[PDB]
Amino acid sequence: SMSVKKPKRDDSKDLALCSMILTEMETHEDAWPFLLPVNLKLVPGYKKVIKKPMDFSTIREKLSSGQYPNLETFALDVRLVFDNCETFNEDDSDIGRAGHNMRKYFEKKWTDTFK
């Protein structure tokens, strides 16, 4: 509260570390469904159904231009990528499996880096 603060957590490496994690996700073999925005002209249903599209390229541009105020807003966009994937894709599809694998991969790097 006013003039009463928890001790200051060092957040000065967060930007760099989120970039590293993002590099690792970009270079994973199962990243291909997620590298670029879904083409809303060519994929029936996507525009109406997925209210907040997100992809790794869009996260990378936001990261590079100071549009994440903190590491939690970064994690929200990453998870949004996988949540959208589960909304639109059957679990037993290549893309549906990719998304489960990538979420797993991300959540481990996240815990190991920050928790």
Instruction: For residue 43, give the DSSP letter.
Output: S
**Within a 13 Å sphere around the CA of 88, how many CA atoms are in the beta-carbon half?**
24
Q: Is 106:25 a contact under the CB 8 Å cutoff?
A: yes
Instruction: For residue 32, give the DSSP letter.
Output: G
Q: Which sign does the torsion angle of CA 16, 23, 85, 49 carry?
A: positive
- The structure's method of determination equals X-ray
Q: What is the Cα–Cα distance from 107 to 115, expressed in whole angstroms?
A: 11
- Give all domains of the chain, ordered by start, each with its CATH number: 1-115 (1.20.920.10)
Q: What is the Cα–Cα distance from 52 to 65, expressed in whole angstroms?
A: 20
Biggest CA–CA distance in the chain, Å, is 54
Integer Rg of the chain from CA: 16
* 3-state secondary structure at position 70: coil
Give resolution, Å, one decimal. Answer: 1.9
- Long-range CB pairs of 61-68 (<8 Å, 24+ gap) are 63/15, 63/18, 63/19, 63/22, 68/18
Tokens of 10: 């060092």
Residue with tokens 């967060």: 14
CB atoms within 10 A of CB 41: 7
